[PDB]
Design a protein around this ligand. Structure first.
Ligand SMILES: [Cu+2]
Length: 655
């Protein structure tokens, strides 16, 4: 019953991790989605600044990760992924965070080859008139102040819910004494209205908005605006018939309106190729929906349904009169539409409960994806017609998987093995951001092929008395892996997208052990590996081997913890290759980082927790972090350092 700080999350069932994002986390997150994944083994984060990192799963980047919020897809608008999908998520305002590793589900949309990440809120459960309140406050080094409110009220027939947050921090320092360009500020407000006419029926309306800003040590521009607008309608109908367990219907609308520039959170770099003030505004409008039936009978469960999605991207930019020194801000010009995506899919998942110790799960999905290029012109020179203006392209993509789970006779042990095949239609960033496409093509839009992934997942759960253990491995091949290559060319830096063939393997494992009634210990390991077979060399942007060691003492109302994080050097690199955000250049040094936490239950409604992160003020950087920008003093290919010693205190309220 004793409160504690979360430093790692175990895998609680085959391929699946479930955690409550409201619990304090001990390397302390910057109020974004990527940081709350740092505690799940297998995740690493490309750091841009103090917040809004870009999540990598088993070395896989971007849309290979399927990231949903309440069942819906929120997509960013920045062509450089300043505003990756997790940058809009404040996890403390959600109730549950679920990760499913590998291409092992078809229920949640197309293309999820690396895994599926689901932030969800539970519907209120009032049976009579009442209210509940959850809230938290966090105070830390470098002006870190966070504020969270989750209030609801209702009765048997319906409810109203408000969740909200305001979070901010000044620039932090690395372990060498340097101020890193990294301040950020986030806020969210979301309302939910629930109608429960009877216990077999729920209809929920949601709407919310947020905004933010972030300074980016690792970019030429900062994010001065991360506007989000969200609308959602959900309908869940239970026990419809004796076999129809559940019908689910859902629509959602998500809008992102992002501004980056070189003059609101920094000064233009005189020595750079942007000495004049310069702003770029972009937006993304996403409309999608889902309809799913769940059937149960005999020893079988069948989930069947369809989904659909449309999204639209537009941009406009500022102007600088070199003669007048007159600046015309981006909002003075009309939006120019540049891209529209569509997807429609049908999916089905069948489970056979053979006997009591054996489960077979099989899933299939057929997707129809299309995209239209609306760029009339391309942006060295301002000229350039666009060769594929108003062109469309489409494909039809089947995906599926089979998984066997066997429960042992003489132990609390589950073994599993799965084969998955996933096909992903290319990203906005894979089609529109590359300066060049494959050789001989007119552009990336016209030629880049869908990515096709075939992977074996396997592993085991041990749910013992004093020992809790789990392991999960994977071997896989990727046909037409979409890879970025970087060139200088005096123009600046310029990117080419190509398709290559890849081999991947890796795994995660971890154990929890109750030493005594007060002492517990846990460890985890994560490894990922990648080879570019077409070019006979290593895949880029693969995080090195990582281990975590934790030790906790609990005693009635309080606990104390310590944590060692140890990561090996990454000597497997592919220089000047990567994705749309980052590229490899050097082998990384290994490092160790040490942290302490504690927690105290003051009462049943208020608990306190506190941590020191990186106690020894280690100066270090991660393999995947962005190179620092020359305008901030960084040498060439020197990557953004991680924070030095950091103190924080948190008070959680539950009424
Ligand atoms: Cu941007």
């Amino acid at each position: 019953l004793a409160p504690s700080v979360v430093t790692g999350v175990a895998q609680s069932s085959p391929l699946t991790i479930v955690t409550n994002p409201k619990e304090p986390r001990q390397p302390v997150p910057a109020s974004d989605g990527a940081d709350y994944l740092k505690t799940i083994p297998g995740f690493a984060v490309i750091r841009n600044g103090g917040s809004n990192g870009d999540p990598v799963l088993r070395g896989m980047f971007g849309s290979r990760l399927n990231i949903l919020t309440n069942g819906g897809m929120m997509l960013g608008a920045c062509p450089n992924r300043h505003d990756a999908p997790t940058s809009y998520i404040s996890p403390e305002t959600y109730d549950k965070l679920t990760v499913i590793k590998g291409p092992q589900t078809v229920l949640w949309g197309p293309g999820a080859s690396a895994g599926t990440i689901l932030f969800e809120r539970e519907p209120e459960r009032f049976g009579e008139l009442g209210s509940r309140v959850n809230a938290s406050l966090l105070a830390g080094s470098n002006g870190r102040f966070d504020k969270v409110l989750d209030a609801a009220a209702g009765n048997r027939l319906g409810y109203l819910r408000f969740t909200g947050n305001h979070a901010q921090s000044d620039d932090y320092e690395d372990g060498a004494g340097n101020t890193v360009p990294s301040r950020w500020k986030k806020w969210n407000g979301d309302v939910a209205v629930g109608w429960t006419p009877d216990e077999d029926t729920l209809i929920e309306l949601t709407a919310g908005k947020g905004d933010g800003e972030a300074r980016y040590a690792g970019r030429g521009m900062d994010g001065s605006q991360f506007k989000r607008e969200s609308l959602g309608l959900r309908f869940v109908k239970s026990n419809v018939s004796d076999v129809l367990e559940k019908v689910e219907a859902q629509v959602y609308y998500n809008y992102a309106d992002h501004i980056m520039d070189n003059f609101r959170l920094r000064t233009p770099d005189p020595s750079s190729m942007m000495p004049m003030p310069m702003a770029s505004q972009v937006d993304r409008r996403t409309l999608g929906g889902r309809l799913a039936a769940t059937w149960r009978w005999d020893d079988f469960k069948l989930v069947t349904g369809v989904d659909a999605m449309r999204n639209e991207h537009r941009a406009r930019g500022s102007k600088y009169d070199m003669m007048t020194d007159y600046y015309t801000d981006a909002d003075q010009f009309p939006w120019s539409k540049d891209a529209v995506f569509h997807n429609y899919g049908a999916f089905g998942e069948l489970t056979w409960f053979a006997a009591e110790r054996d489960r077979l799960i099989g899933g299939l999905r057929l997707d129809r994806a299309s995209v239209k290029d609306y760029r009339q012109t391309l942006k060295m020179g301002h000229a350039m017609a666009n060769p594929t203006a108003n062109d469309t392209r489409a494909d039809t993509l089947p995906s599926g998987f089979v998984r066997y789970e066997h429960d042992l006779a003489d132990s609390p042990t589950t073994l599993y093995a799965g084969l998955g095949h996933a096909e992903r239609f290319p990203d906005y960033w894979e089609l529109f951001s590359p300066k060049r496409g494959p050789n001989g093509s007119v552009n990336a839009f016209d030629k880049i092929k869908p990515e096709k992934t075939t992977q074996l997942d396997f592993g085991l759960q041990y749910n013992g008395d004093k020992l809790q253990a789990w392991a999960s491995g994977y071997v896989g091949v990727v046909q037409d892996f979409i890879l970025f290559s970087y060139r200088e060319g005096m123009m600046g830096s310029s990117t080419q997208a190509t398709n290559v063939d890849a081999r991947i393997m890796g795994g995660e494992l971890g154990a929890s052990y109750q030493l005594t009634g007060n002492w517990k210990t846990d460890a985890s390991l994560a490894y990922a590996w990648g080879k570019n077979s077409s070019d006979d060399r290593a895949l880029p942007q693969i995080p090195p081997l990582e281990a975590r060691f934790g030790l906790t003492y609990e005693e009635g109302d309080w606990s104390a913890g310590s944590l060692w994080r140890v990561v090996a050097p990454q000597n497997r690199i592919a220089r000047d290759q990567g994705n749309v955000v980052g590229k490899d250049f050097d082998k990384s040094a290994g490092f160790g980082v040490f942290s302490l936490n504690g927690a105290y239950r003051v009462t049943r409604n208020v608990k306190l927790s506190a941590g020191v992160d990186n106690l020894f003020d280690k100066d270090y950087t991660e393999h995947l972090n962005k190179a620092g920008d020359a305008g901030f003093g960084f040498s060439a290919n020197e990557t953004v350092p991680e924070p030095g010693r950091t103190f924080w205190t948190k008070v959680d309220f539950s009424f």
